[PDB]
Amino acid sequence: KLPPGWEKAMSRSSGRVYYFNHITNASQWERPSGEPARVRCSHLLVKHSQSRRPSSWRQEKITRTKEEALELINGYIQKIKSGEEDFESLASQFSDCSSAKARGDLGAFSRGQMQKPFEDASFALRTGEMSGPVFTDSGIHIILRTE
């Protein structure tokens, strides 16, 4: 019916159908477009107090809660989708990953290299597409597939 991970749901406020992906947590009004050895992705990470290493180049001691980190992630997604801000600009400024210095770029990778929920979302993304909040032991990610 639909590409991997995608399902149909009903909007609670509008009553119009929308599409949601249970691997990437993406959601959108438009019906999605219809696997490679490798993909290339960028990401923006927001760490919290329960991350594996609650520290980053931005903050020696990361103290925000998981709920607070998710609110930040949701805010960044809103600004990306509205075009108020670019993914690469937010990732350079706010990602708790050292990959911030490269606009969030992680380079290319295969299955069996990254944390599983990150890997699964990355390979379920099509080129150009972006995830919703993706949860790993490191924190909460926004993932942009570039190749």
Ligand SMILES: CC(=O)c1cc[nH]c1
């Ligand atoms: C087709 C698709 O994936 C789109 C279109 C606008 N946003 C997402």
Ligand SMILES: CC(=O)c1cc[nH]c1
């Ligand atoms: C140049 C450098 O170390 C970094 C780390 C994160 N952003 C920039």
Ligand SMILES: CC(=O)c1cc[nH]c1
């Ligand atoms: C892709 C992945 O698993 C990462 C990246 C930074 N922390 C975890």
